[PDB]
Amino acid sequence: ATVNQLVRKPRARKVAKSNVPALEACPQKRGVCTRVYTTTPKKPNSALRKVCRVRLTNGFEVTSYIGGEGHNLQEHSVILIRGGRVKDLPGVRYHTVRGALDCSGVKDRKQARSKYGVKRPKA
Amino acid sequence: SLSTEATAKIVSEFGRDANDTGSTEVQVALLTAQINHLQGHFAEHKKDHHSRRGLLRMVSQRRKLLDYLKRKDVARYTQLIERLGLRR
Amino acid sequence: SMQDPIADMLTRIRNGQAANKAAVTMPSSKLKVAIANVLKEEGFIEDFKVEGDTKPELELTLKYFQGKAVVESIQRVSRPGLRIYKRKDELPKVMAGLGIAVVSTSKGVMTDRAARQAGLGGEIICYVA
Amino acid sequence: KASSXA
RNA sequence: UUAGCUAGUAGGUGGGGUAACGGCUCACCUAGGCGACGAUCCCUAGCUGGUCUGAGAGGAUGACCAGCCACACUGGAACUG
RNA sequence: GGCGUAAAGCGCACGCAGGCGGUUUGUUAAGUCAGAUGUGAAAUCCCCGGGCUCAACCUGGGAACUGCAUCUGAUACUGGCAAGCUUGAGUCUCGUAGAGGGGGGUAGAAUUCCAGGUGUAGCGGUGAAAUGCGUAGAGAUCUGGAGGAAUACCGGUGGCGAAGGCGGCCCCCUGGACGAAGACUGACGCUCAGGUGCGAAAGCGUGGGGAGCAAACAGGAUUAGAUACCCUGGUAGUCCACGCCGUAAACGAUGUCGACUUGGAGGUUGUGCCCUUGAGGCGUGGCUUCCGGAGCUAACGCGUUAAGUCGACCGCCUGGGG
Structure with missing residues (x-):
């Protein structure tokens, strides 16, 4: 409102909160992967979404989504998580990178293989 | 408020001349007189918070009154204070 | 007040x-x-x-x-709650020029268009359109 | 119109 | 959701000291000195030139390059010059 | 950028620091302003060129580095100093209305209770009922006493206060407001973080008080249940004293202060005028409803008692949930 007021208690910015805080605010992280489960999403949709509870490197343990039809993951493994949430499964704020570390890319995927990690099959 | 016969005399003394109910040294003398007088009221009662509030209006105003006098003329400020006995 | x-x-x-x-x-x-x-x-x-x-x-x-x-309009610029003063080039121009802006200078009041050419500057009283 | 909570 | 902080503390005088002024040191003496324009206390952090973004005012940042600073196993000290 | 309802005006008031401040002259020159001089490394960005084939890169020159200090000028505005003026503010006088407040009396009506007379079996209650209450005679009715509480009618989108909130009549102490011809003072003011004070009901503490009502509690019904709604009771409480508590949809859900901007119809309380020849006839204040122009508004609406058009200071908001 008033200048005098702004002069006194000055206007204060409101910091932002990284939707993904699996620390360092850094590209991706390595994690041991505690369990490999499958769950059900919100009311509108109904699948058997695949997920894994991963013990990151920085100590935070967190649940991550496994994108693509099928995966090699299980018990131990060592995926590397990324970012981007999964608006359908709450709590799932991270996606494990496919075809990274102990994670196998989606078998046979031919479209947009950059994700789901796969290599050009016989050009 | 305060007996007309009372208020008058007051005006004379401090006010340069009769009818000079405008000079600062007057309101103060007047205000004081009233205040001092109101003490005995609230002395008992104490619950008449409403009258108290009006009282406060006087106590306050006088201060700001004394503060004006001082600012533009220290002499009359002191002189007045003493002859009235306060402003500790 | x-x-x-x-x-x-x-x-x-x-x-x-x-x-x-x-x-x-x-x-x-x-x-x-x-x-x-x-x-x-x-x-x-x-x-x-x-x-x-x-x-x-x-x-x-x-x-x-x-x-x-x-x-068309008239606004107060410098006020007792926040005084505003401007240099020679910092002098404000109203409606790309089509409109005066009263600026008081150390050599008597003027108009933005006035004071400008005048060479000096000072507090700006208001904006008239 | 509205999902996951509304 | 830190409000009070300080005795060499603040000043004086007087010896000593330093390359030099100086509480730097000591002795004596007044009793002060800082603080809500935020001291003190916590947390964080190398500072500037600039860098990124923005129409701009600003917001963010200070890797590479240059100026200033600081440290060089941790803590402390002097010596040489 | 916002806050009547969307998130948002502190429940209200006083006021220290601070912010802001009517008007006229002189002066000051700090703020402010113009010229000058130092300085503001280089590089980078930028403007015009040059060179690697181009470009990136490299480079010449220039502008810029919006800043600071010193000095010589300026004087409107702002600040200080000096001296006034009065439209702000305040003082006195004379009236005016008022559930304003504190304290103390008292009146009448009424409920309940008790004593006593008459007087008979019923009363009370509901949608219907039952519990309850009566033949140690209720209810009813008559006389009188006690006690507490509140005070019909008047009473009114009346009035008073900062708000919370205040209504029988009377005394005592007291606050404020409004008008009018005036007298005086002289800008002494506006605002207010923190501070301080006031602050509905409920509630707490120590006591008193206790009729009616009435959380909890009993019982009676209703219901599938009914730990409610309805009924018969009934404690705390409601009242008082002195503390404490400090909360409400403390709402106009709309901070306070000042100025400006068409009207219409009331209510209310003043006042000046004119055969007052009318119960009134024409004016000029304060408080206060309503309707509604422009304008504002997202709309609803607000609308000279603005959510209009300005200004000073304050407070407050910054997605839902958590």
Whole structure:
């Protein structure tokens, strides 16, 4: 409102909160992967979404989504998580990178293989 | 408020001349007189918070009154204070 | 409260021409006249009048044209709550120029367009459109 | 119109 | 959701000291000195030139390059010059 | 950028620091302003060129580095100093209305209770009922006493206060407001973080008080249940004293202060005028409803008692949930 007021208690910015805080605010992280489960999403949709509870490197343990039809993951493994949430499964704020570390890319995927990690099959 | 016969005399003394109910040294003398007088009221009662509030209006105003006098003329400020006995 | 007599002019005037009147009066103040003069000279009001002796009174003869008045708008810039002063080049120009902006200078009041060429500068009283 | 909570 | 902080503390005088002024040191003496324009206390952090973004006012940042600073196993000290 | 309802005006008031401040002259020159001089490394960005084939890169020159200090000027505005003026503010006088407040009396009506007379079996209650209450005689009715509480009618989108909130009549102490011809003072003001004070009901503490009502509690019904609604009771409480508590949809859900901007119809309380020849006839204040122009508004609406057009200071908001 008033200048005098702004002069006194000055206007204060409101910091932002990284939707993904699996620390360092850094590209991706390595994690041991505690369990490999499958769950059900919100009311509108109904699948058997695949997920894994991963013990990151920085100590935070967190649940991550496994994108693509099928995966090699299980018990131990060592995926590397990324970012981007999964608006359908709450709590799932991270996606494990496919075809990274102990994670196998989606078998046979031919479209947009950059994700789901796969290599050009016989050009 | 305060007996007309009372208020008058007051005006004379401090006010340069009769009818000079405008000079600062007057309101103060007047205000004081009233205040001092109101003490005995609230002395008992104490619950008449409403009258108290009006009282406060006087106590306050006088201060700001004394503060004006001082600012533009220290002499009359002191002189007045003493002859009235306060402003500790 | 009385705190600001200048924004009382601009307001009374902006309000007067609002209620399509021809004359608006207010107590007189030296600076007020200075401004009055400005508006006249710049053709924003037919003219001033000051028939005040003991209690200075100021009247302003309002102008008009077609389906509107002369002053499309008038705002107070520098106020007692936040004074604004400007250099020679920092002087503000109203409506790409089509409109004065009263600036007081150490050598008597002026208009943005005036003071500009004048070479100096100073506090800017207001914005008239 | 509205999902996951509304 | 830190409000009070300080005795060499603040000043004086007087010896000593330093390359030099100086509480730097000591002795004596007044009793002060800082603080809500935020001291003190916590947390964080190398500072500037600039860098990124923005129409701009600003917001963010200070890797590479240059100026200033600081440290060189941790803590402390002097010596040489 | 916002806050009547969307998130948002502190429940209200006083006021220290601070912010802001009517008007006229002189002066000051700090703020402010113009010229000058130092300085503001280089590089980078930028403007015009040059060179690697181009470009990136490299480079010449220039502008810029919006800043600071010193000096010589300026004087409107702002600040200080000096001396006034009065439209702000305040003082006195004379009236005016008022559930304003504190304290103390008292009146009448009424409920309940008790004593006593008459007087008979019923009363009370509901949608219907039952519990309850009566033949140690209720209810009813008559006389009188006690006690507490509140005070019909008047009473009115009346009035008073800062708000919370205040209504029988009377005394005592007291606050404020409004008008009018005036007298005086002289800008002594506006605002207010923190501070301080006031602050509905409920509630707490120590006591008193206790009729009616009435959380909890009993019983009676109703219901599938009915730990409610309805009924018969009934404690705390409601009242008082002195503390404490400090909360409400403390709402106009709309901070306070000042100025400006068409009207219409009331209510209310003043006042000046004119055969007052009318119960009134024409004016000029304060408080206060309503309707509604422009304008504002997202709309609803607000609308000279603005959510209009300005200004000073304050407080407050910054997605839902958590």
